[PDB]
Structure 1
Amino acid sequence: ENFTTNLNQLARVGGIDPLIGREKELERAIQVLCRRRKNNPLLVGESGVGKTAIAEGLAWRIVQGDVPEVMADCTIYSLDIGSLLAGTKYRGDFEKRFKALLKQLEQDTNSILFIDEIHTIINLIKPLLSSGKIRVIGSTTYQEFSNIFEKDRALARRFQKIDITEPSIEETVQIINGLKPKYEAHHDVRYTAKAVRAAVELAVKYINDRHLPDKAIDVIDEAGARARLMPVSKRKKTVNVADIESVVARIARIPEKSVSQSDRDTLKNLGDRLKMLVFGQDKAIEALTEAIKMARAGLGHEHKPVGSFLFAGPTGVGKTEVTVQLSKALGIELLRFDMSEYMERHTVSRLIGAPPGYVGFDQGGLLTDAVIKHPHAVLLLDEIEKAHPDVFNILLQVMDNGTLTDNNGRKADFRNVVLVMTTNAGVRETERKSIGLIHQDNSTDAMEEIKKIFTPEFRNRLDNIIWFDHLSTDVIHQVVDKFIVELQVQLDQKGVSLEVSQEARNWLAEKGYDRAMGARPMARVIQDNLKKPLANELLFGSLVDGGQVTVALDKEKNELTYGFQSA
């Protein structure tokens, strides 16, 4: 009694919440219990799916009487793992306590024991099952079932697998609606029907953390607590959809704008936002917006991925910038996998294999699990030309069916992820000089390179070939100013003030920036040129105090001249 509480008796007095739905799942649980042998139900599931609640809901049904006569008198007791284990801290002392508890249940016929999180415990579990005097309910995670139940033949034979699947979107809101009267009575304030339905959709799309149904129940209670606690509750007797989103911000860790509904609103601002931080190449961003626009409208196959993008040109063509901004604008975690490392059998196995350890089974496919970890996260691929043709074939499979299957058996859905690729074929051909007495430009069309490097089917499945325009000199000058501004703000904290001449910015721009390497060398060029000379003075010299710095160039020698003042 003390070690294990009585759920059936508890439900008779109250506390247990009535279970709505799950009629088919509960029906099967009743069926196995009525069996002469192998009558130990196993509510396999995931955290938050309601498997524990199903046990509590089953106990309520028995007292209510919605069960066969044989099961009407049965009593479900939930074994407390913490109570028995706590206070002993010894091997075999815990078992002695379990023997006494088991004896009490064995003495009383038609007694049901519920071992929540049974995998944690799993010596005495096998004997009670083999005897068959008392049937036992066990809740274990799907991952733990394979690790423990499947490996042990005896445990698997006695326990019957009952598949507990998460309810659909419509089902999840219905569960909240069924349980909404209880909540409203508890705090005396109600939620609008639009708000509860919206909570399910907004929670899963942004938080993506515990469970589809669990997040809905947790998000509704969190919203009511904030609104009721606030003094405005007297004036505000209903919960607005935005109010939940504002409360959801606390458990989101992102601004309210991201949580705010932007299915159609993001389209207009996202186009402007890309241009706000990126100068020029409006056509390139328009191609990206057009492909994702199709998914929001919804006039497409559900399995087909959200969007397909492509990038060409030299390294550092804003692939990281546009992707980071695109991910930020869409409020999706940025996931980037580099094909540059996938050039060997061991490395190429990484997409669907577990390079960290063969013993390790949880990670499985690193690229595949990344999608599973974040359903909406964007996938950024770079230097795909390097990768072997065989690896590229698997990409074609997911693009067609919009789904993948891991070696471990996990299934990943690409219906919610946009796939973008980056290619740098142009730099290799253009830099080469023609083999002739008089040289000729070796620049070639980017589309030509995509066709030769990749198979025709890839282009056919791909919605369109997107070529990003090359960087402009005006942008490079602005980029130089940004780095100086970044360096400038860093110096202001220490108390040093740096002033750079306009001619100095142009001077660094010509030598630093390269056509083949884009803006990558300019970044490095600004660090060594400016940080190194001041660094010596900052430690010891004129810049130790005051921090007065001037930057200028000498036209006669074409070398930068640095002036240091003690100040």
Structure 2
Amino acid sequence: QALQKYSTDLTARAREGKLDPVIGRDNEIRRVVQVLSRRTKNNPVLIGEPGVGKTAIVEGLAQRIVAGDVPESLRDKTIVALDLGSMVRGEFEERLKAVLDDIKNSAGQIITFIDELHTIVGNMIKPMLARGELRLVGATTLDEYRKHIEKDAALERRFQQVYVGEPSVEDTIGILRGLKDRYEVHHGVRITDSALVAAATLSDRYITARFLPDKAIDLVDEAASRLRMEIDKEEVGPDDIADVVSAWTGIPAGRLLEGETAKLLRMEDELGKRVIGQKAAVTAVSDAVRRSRAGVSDPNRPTGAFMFLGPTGVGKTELAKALADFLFDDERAMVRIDMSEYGEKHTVARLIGAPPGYVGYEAGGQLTEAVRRRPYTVVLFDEIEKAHPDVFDVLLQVLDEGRLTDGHGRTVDFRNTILILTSNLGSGGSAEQVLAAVRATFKPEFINRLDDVLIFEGLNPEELVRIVDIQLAQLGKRLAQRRLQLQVSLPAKRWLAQRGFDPVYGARPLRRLVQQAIGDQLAKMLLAGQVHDGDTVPVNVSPDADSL
């Protein structure tokens, strides 16, 4: 008791009850008390993620001790904690000597407890430990333990691992409903099982950074404190927590609800807000994605394997960029891999990378290393017609079983991704020879496993005004730093169509063609004068070109 100033007790304060009961996880306690009852390789170590209940388990064991249920060997033996962030160059070993000598002259079996000892281990506790007078019960995380206790240890022969992965939704619900009254007297508002389960499921699904047993308690206590402060509604409810989750992540409370009906019914113009025209294609793709997640298709298949070809610049990619945006909440998800370099027989191994020990190994394959991470992407395939007739075997293997093999040896999974095989075939035919050319060029049976093979319909000579109109609505945001508004006039706006189409690349220059013109033609006025932040900047169609 001489230097008990860097150490807290667990049984003394247990004699008062300032701890929390840890109902659940009764296997781990039995495993630990069994390990601690051996003769060699005793003093186990708790291995698990941060925020899972390791301290909870050791406290539950402490409470079972103070009650008295364990074998009388372990009975009548106290526990003492330690905090290492208080010890830490030097004199850390001096205080280590002090505490170890204290334990040693205590002359008993007073168990210790050392949290995150991966900062402690070194050679100073092994001569103490391989003698049988002290019992240390530590804790750390999996990969960290694999670091400090495997390379420089040579001590792992005297440490026994114990695994505590994570509780489930149903278990953390029981945990919450056990730990409810304490807060109903801390603040005291009211609690609803609907609120508890909503917190559990929503945290599990959307707060993908922290973990369950502490993550749920954090949100619940935060909502309770907010609703106690709000009195500056005497209950907490599902909305009373969804508001907090929305404030936390950024996604509003609306979309944080039922994710099947109210989502698969949003396959409407919500796409057409980014894509223009091609409503037939949007409808076909929406039906394909709706029926795919019904729950009757085979569980090993891409979530969609359709392709679309024809004229460029119509927004072929734009459909996919909007599609990934709506589904996976990001448009920086699709990955475009051109099928141009893959015109050689040998280069098919570029998108995998076969051997360990050859040129391209560490970089991985172009396709897999960009899929095994972020398994939610939307892969694109430009000019699928120019790829050698050997990658199509790879594609077959993809859309015949939702998995593939890289070179490292890993297995990449494709059962919740979307394939899109763009092209440029069909330059002359409307709907009669384009399908015949697609049948003849590709293997006519490989196409069978594909979904709808729709062709994008051309842009109406009128329906360029809508695309350029979204373009103008966008570029209106550009000069929001000086609030200089812009003009609109059908002659000027339609003047962009016949002079910016150039029907070989569709509408790719239609952004630069107008942005450089208007921006850099007004950029001198923006420094000289002639405008302030209420002026329509009336631009007109001069006899030849677009001056102001």
TM norm. shorter chain > 0.5: yes
Match of 1:53 among 47, 52, 56: 56
Report how far residue 262 of structure 1 moved. 4.0
Of 123-132 and 527-536, deviating more is 123-132
Whether contact under 8 Å (1:266, 1:330) holds in the other structure is no
Separation of aligned partners in 2, 1:147 and 1:115? 17
Whether contact under 8 Å (1:551, 1:560) holds in the other structure is no
Report how far residue 52 of structure 1 moved. 2.7
* Residues 158-205 of structure 1: per-residue CA shift (max 9 Å, x gap): 211212121222222122122223333332233211221122111222
In structure 1, the partner of 2:519 is 531
Residue 274 (structure 2) pairs with residue 265 (structure 1) = no
Match of 2:242 among 245, 255, 278: 245
Whether contact under 8 Å (1:295, 1:306) holds in the other structure is no
In structure 1, the partner of 2:27 is 24
Partner AA of 2:179 in structure 1? L
In structure 1, the partner of 2:109 is 110
Whether contact under 8 Å (1:337, 1:379) holds in the other structure is yes
Whether contact under 8 Å (1:29, 1:41) holds in the other structure is yes
Give the number of aligned pairs: 528
Whether contact under 8 Å (1:339, 1:387) holds in the other structure is no
Of 223-232 and 382-391, deviating more is 382-391
In structure 2, the partner of 1:83 is 86
Distance 1:189 1:338, change over 3 A: same
Partner AA of 2:277 in structure 1? G
Whether contact under 8 Å (2:14, 2:62) holds in the other structure is yes
* Residues 270-326 of structure 1: per-residue CA shift (max 9 Å, x gap): 42522445443333333443344357655567x657833544236665466555555
Alignment of 1:161-240 (within 5 A): 161-231=161-231, 236-240=233-237
Partner AA of 2:151 in structure 1? K
Alignment of 1:367-516 (within 5 A): 367-371=371-375, 378-383=376-381, 385=384, 417=416, 419-426=417-424, 429-430=425-426, 445=434, 449=438, 460=449, 468-491=456-479, 493-494=481-482, 496-516=484-504
In structure 2, the partner of 1:437 is none
Match of 2:334 among 309, 333, 336: 336
Whether contact under 8 Å (2:35, 2:44) holds in the other structure is yes
Partner AA of 1:220 in structure 2? V
In structure 1, the partner of 2:39 is 36
Distance 1:183 1:403, change over 3 A: farther
Separation of aligned partners in 2, 1:536 and 1:526? 16
Report how far residue 459 of structure 1 moved. 6.1
Separation of aligned partners in 1, 2:178 and 2:421? 53
Distance 1:308 1:77, change over 3 A: farther
Partner AA of 1:289 in structure 2? S
Whether contact under 8 Å (1:311, 1:423) holds in the other structure is yes
Separation of aligned partners in 1, 2:316 and 2:80? 58
Distance 1:291 1:68, change over 3 A: farther
Separation of aligned partners in 1, 2:164 and 2:414? 24
Separation of aligned partners in 2, 1:422 and 1:552? 42
Whether contact under 8 Å (2:198, 2:238) holds in the other structure is yes
Distance 1:145 1:333, change over 3 A: farther
Distance 1:527 1:285, change over 3 A: same
Distance 1:188 1:540, change over 3 A: closer
Separation of aligned partners in 2, 1:381 and 1:442? 26
Whether contact under 8 Å (1:425, 1:446) holds in the other structure is no
Separation of aligned partners in 2, 1:455 and 1:128? 75
In structure 2, the partner of 1:254 is 251
Separation of aligned partners in 1, 2:451 and 2:308? 15
Separation of aligned partners in 2, 1:447 and 1:221? 64
Question: Equivalent residue of 2:179, what SS?
Answer: helix
Structure 2: runs of 5+ lacking an equivalent: 342-346
In structure 1, the partner of 2:121 is 122
Partner AA of 2:27 in structure 1? K
Distance 1:100 1:474, change over 3 A: farther
Residue 304 (structure 2) pairs with residue 308 (structure 1) = yes
Distance 1:526 1:457, change over 3 A: same
Distance 1:492 1:562, change over 3 A: farther
* Residues 356-415 of structure 1: per-residue CA shift (max 9 Å, x gap): x979xxxx95643434xxxxxx31222365889998878877767767899999998767
* Residues 4-31 of structure 1: per-residue CA shift (max 9 Å, x gap): 2112323332332111211112221111
Separation of aligned partners in 1, 2:105 and 2:492? 92
Separation of aligned partners in 2, 1:407 and 1:13? 60
Whether contact under 8 Å (2:465, 2:494) holds in the other structure is yes
Separation of aligned partners in 2, 1:519 and 1:498? 22
Separation of aligned partners in 2, 1:269 and 1:253? 20
Distance 1:406 1:347, change over 3 A: closer
Question: Equivalent residue of 1:78, what SS?
Answer: coil
Of 192-201 and 441-450, deviating more is 441-450
Of 254-263 and 520-529, deviating more is 254-263
Of 465-474 and 242-251, deviating more is 465-474
Of 51-60 and 405-414, deviating more is 405-414
Whether contact under 8 Å (1:49, 1:213) holds in the other structure is yes
Distance 1:544 1:170, change over 3 A: closer
Report how far residue 554 of structure 1 moved. 5.1
Match of 2:70 among 67, 71, 77: 67
Whether contact under 8 Å (1:44, 1:164) holds in the other structure is yes
Separation of aligned partners in 2, 1:272 and 1:442? 26
Residue 547 (structure 2) pairs with residue 562 (structure 1) = yes
Of 540-549 and 469-478, deviating more is 540-549
Report how far residue 34 of structure 1 moved. 0.9
Whether contact under 8 Å (1:351, 1:368) holds in the other structure is no
Whether contact under 8 Å (2:276, 2:467) holds in the other structure is no
Report how far residue 242 of structure 1 moved. 1.0
Distance 1:37 1:27, change over 3 A: same
Whether contact under 8 Å (1:350, 1:365) holds in the other structure is no
RMSD: 4.2
Question: Equivalent residue of 1:172, what SS?
Answer: helix
Question: Equivalent residue of 2:41, what SS?
Answer: coil
Partner AA of 2:418 in structure 1? V
Of 128-137 and 538-547, deviating more is 538-547
In structure 1, the partner of 2:344 is none
Question: Equivalent residue of 1:381, what SS?
Answer: strand
Report how far residue 71 of structure 1 moved. 2.0
In structure 2, the partner of 1:436 is none
In structure 2, the partner of 1:518 is 506
Q: Which has the higher strand share?
A: 1
Report how far residue 42 of structure 1 moved. 1.7
Whether contact under 8 Å (1:550, 1:562) holds in the other structure is no
Q: Which has the higher helix share?
A: 1
Whether contact under 8 Å (2:195, 2:237) holds in the other structure is yes
**Percent of pairs identical after alignment?**
39
In structure 2, the partner of 1:3 is 6
Whether contact under 8 Å (2:405, 2:411) holds in the other structure is yes
Whether contact under 8 Å (1:200, 1:216) holds in the other structure is yes
